Amino acid sequence: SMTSHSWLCDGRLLCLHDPSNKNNWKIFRECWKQGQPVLVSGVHKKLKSELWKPEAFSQEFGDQDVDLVNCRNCAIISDVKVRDFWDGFEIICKRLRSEDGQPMVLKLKDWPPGEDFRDMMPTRFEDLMENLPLPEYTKRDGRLNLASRLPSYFVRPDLGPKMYNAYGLITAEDRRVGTTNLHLDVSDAVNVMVYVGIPIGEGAHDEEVLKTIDEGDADEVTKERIHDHKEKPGALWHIYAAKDAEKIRELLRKVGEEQGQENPPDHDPIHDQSWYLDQTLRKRLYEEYGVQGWAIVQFLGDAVFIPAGAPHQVHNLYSCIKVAEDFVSPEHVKHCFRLT
Ligand SMILES: CNCc1ccncc1
Ligand SMILES: [Cl-]
Ligand SMILES: [Cl-]
Ligand SMILES: [Cl-]
Ligand SMILES: [Cl-]
Ligand SMILES: [Mn+2]
């Protein structure tokens, strides 16, 4: 039967089932006040699906200049055309190649650039903002969004949304690599998976995707969404409570030292955005520091709510289009305050 919600991560993660249910706030707010992330499924069904395809982005915007990142070695590919990224999104034999002759795993950097999303893509902007879940929190003028209401004593988020476009990681070696490394944001955010691209030509790597989710520490209820409902999995997240950020810094300082980095004892390895916590680092965090995280698989249409100050990392399983909006909830406004 249709139900209001369910639990993931063995009861530690709320999953809301209907993105436009006017009563969601009653379940949401209790979980949110405790510093937990929240998942809302089904947002894809509310969107105009023709607006969120890689072929449309290539056709409409393909002549713009951009930089890309090689996810495997963090190298920048400077001043290429945006079509060079999009035309390889699903067709592997069209991807830019590394010196070694392999197709590259690429991320499109800062596109649309800065705050231009609304000006460049006015129809996409309308379609996203009108269909965000928890609208009193997430809309620019929502009754519980303080972004437009705070003085300069608080860091205000840039006008959004922001897009995250990147290929899926492929090999066993790629399992230890991040699409986006561990970092934190001083505002809350909602991140929506608007498109998942399962490739062709080398499209058959369905079994390395299961070993990544399994080793990623994903829960048994999550593994059932694949095998039983045939939903398309985009990305594996790890999120940590804001209260655990300093223990995470202590671990990454210890590991930097062991790997012979030379860092001052105050340096911030989370702000550096230089680490991805692989299965080894996540076990060590748990055992040596007492810190447990939320391992989340974001499927097509899943909205991930990320609390202000919560460290998080993302590993694309397949090619993804994500769109995120920043907001400032009253629950987490401490995280953006400039004093004490
Ligand atoms: C896939 N999204 C990448 C991302 C970057 C920063 N924060 C959250 C997500
Ligand atoms: Cl548009
Ligand atoms: Cl709401
Ligand atoms: Cl990064
Ligand atoms: Cl908090
Ligand atoms: Mn982030």
From Swiss-Prot:
Cysteine disulfide links: none
Subcellular locations according to the entry: Nucleus
Name this polypeptide is given: Lysine-specific demethylase 3B
Disease tied to this entry: Diets-Jongmans syndrome: An autosomal dominant disorder characterized by varying degrees of intellectual disability, developmental delay, short stature, and characteristic facial features such as a wide mouth, a pointed chin, long ears and a low columella.
Function according to Swiss-Prot or TrEMBL: Histone demethylase that specifically demethylates 'Lys-9' of histone H3, thereby playing a central role in histone code. Demethylation of Lys residue generates formaldehyde and succinate. May have tumor suppressor activity.
Family that this chain belongs to: Belongs to the JHDM2 histone demethylase family.
Residues that coordinate or bind Fe cation: 183, 185, 312
Source species: Homo sapiens (Human)
Written domain comment of the UniProt record: Leu-Xaa-Xaa-Leu-Leu (LXXLL) motifs are known to mediate the association with nuclear receptors.
More info: Its gene is located in the 5q region of the genome which is deleted in del(5q) interstitial deletion, a frequent deletion found in myeloid leukemias and myelodysplasias, suggesting that it may be a good candidate for the del(5q) tumor suppressor gene.
